[PDB]
């Protein structure tokens, strides 16, 4: 059924303007409904930005009436959002949705960081026990990710194969860069033998690293 | 435009108990109020629309009532499953607005955590850095204090602490305490202890290792 994908730069400098694209699958934006752009700020508060109706009509949030522009491309079945003169304060998660009976359809969102900062990839280090700690039937490995700068980073284990007992940890700032760490718990049979690896992805730096956790010796 | 206020900023219940959220409009929005659920790292999901219309494939434990200015959302019986943020919106007037939102936190029986200590990875030490990370896993409640010792002496500098997003199954929490030093620094001390206090523990939970011990 109805599905939407947002896509856009995940980093832009102040003063510059951002453009996001929303591609809609299994529905015509000309058929019916309102095609919206919504945003959730850091504090998780949401702001309706505006929409374009299936017939070319647009409606905007008066608080951004002079910085925003929503147009469409009927032949490609997509609608865009251009926001001029962006300032640090426009850093948010932009979503596109189909309006109707409220917003029953949302894209998965795309994060946008307005900053004049230097993009930096994330160093990754293994979190392997201190030998002595032999909890037998249950052992825990980790993956420490630090020094990265926009924000996302995708951590996975065995490419998603191993996804139970996965305990990741929210991002934090240090001086001016991000850090995080993922922790997985696995059975002692399994881990000297079989190999677990943490796949780290950092979108805007375009880095998809792969760390292999190996024993203490 | 129209302001939609959501009274209880936060909240926590136990499994089986009912919950009642409130959404107020500065002015009349007839019955065009919709309710959404937003779980960790996921996007908004429509739960109720038309003020009292349970949306497609949404469980019956969810119902809604209200009209023109005063709205509520009721969850018959709460489930650890329902951990999430709940917002309300009005689609009656020109500029669509949403309430500030209400977080819902499940409550469970106390749970003492399991600590894991991690020496710095020789790979990191290469760059003149050393990160000693302490992991406290699956405990409840969230409150938990971590103290770091270096040769028996407190070390309040260079430590970042962080929490997870409460489990959707057992509702426990999990956090990590990251001590970061330089290779020289880390090298001039032999013993590194992770000490932590929690209500489930009368005494301090203690992990530790010796740098000399490979």
């Amino acid at each position: 059924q109805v599905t939407l994908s947002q896509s856009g730069p995940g980093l832009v400098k102040p003063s510059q303007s951002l453009s996001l694209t929303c591609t809609v699958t299994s529905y015509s934006i000309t058929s019916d409904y309102a095609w919206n752009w919504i945003r959730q700020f850091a504090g998780q508060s949401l702001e309706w930005m505006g929409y374009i109706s299936y017939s070319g009509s647009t409606s905007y949030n008066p608080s951004l009436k002079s910085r925003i522009s929503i147009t469409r491309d009927t032949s490609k079945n997509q609608f865009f959002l251009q926001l001029n003169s962006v300032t640090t304060d426009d850093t948010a998660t932009y979503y596109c949705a189909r309006g109707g009976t409220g917003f029953p359809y949302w894209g998965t969102g795309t994060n946008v960081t307005v900053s004049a900062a230097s993009t930096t990839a994330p160093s990754v280090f293994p979190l392997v026990p201190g030998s002595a700690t032999a909890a037998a039937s249950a052992v825990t490995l980790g993956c420490l990710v630090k020094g990265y700068f926009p924000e996302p980073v995708t951590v996975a284990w065995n490419e998603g194969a191993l996804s139970s007992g996965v305990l990741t940890v929210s991002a934090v700032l240090q001086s001016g860069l991000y850090t995080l760490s993922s922790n997985t718990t696995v059975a002692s049979g399994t881990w000297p033998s079989a190999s677990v690896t943490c796949l780290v992805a950092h979108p805007k730096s375009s880095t998809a690293a792969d760390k292999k956790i190996e024993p203490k010796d | 435009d129209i302001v939609m206020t959501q009274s209880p900023k936060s909240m926590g219940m136990s499994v089986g108990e009912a919950v009642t959220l409130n959404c107020k409009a500065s002015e009349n929005v007839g019955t065009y109020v919709s309710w959404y659920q937003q779980k960790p790292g996921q996007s908004p999901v429509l739960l109720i629309y038309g003020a009292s219309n349970r949306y497609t494939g949404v469980p019956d434990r969810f119902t809604g009532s209200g009209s023109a200015t005063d709205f509520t959302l009721t969850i018959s019986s709460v489930q650890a499953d329902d951990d999430a943020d709940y917002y309300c919106g009005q689609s009656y007037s020109s500029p669509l607005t949403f309430g500030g939102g209400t977080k819902l936190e499940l409550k469970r029986a106390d749970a003492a955590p399991t600590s894991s200590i991690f020496p710095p990875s020789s790979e990191q030490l290469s760059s003149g850095g050393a990160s000693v990370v302490c992991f406290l896993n699956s405990f409840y409640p969230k409150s938990i204090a971590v103290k770091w010792k270096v040769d028996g002496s407190k070390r309040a500098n260079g430590t970042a602490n962080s929490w997870t997003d409460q489990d959707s199954a057992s509702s426990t929490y999990s956090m990590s305490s990251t001590l970061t030093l330089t290779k020289d620094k880390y090298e001039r001390h032999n013993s590194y202890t992770c000490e932590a206090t929690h209500k489930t523990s009368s005494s301090p939970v203690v992990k530790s290792f010796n740098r000399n011990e490979c």
């Binding site: 019916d32 409904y33 309102a34 009509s57 409606s59 309006g99 109707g100 | -």
Partner: peptide, 7 residues
């Protein structure tokens, strides 16, 4: 059947 706010 669209909510008033949608035009």
């Amino acid at each position: 059947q669209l909510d008033p706010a949608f035009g």
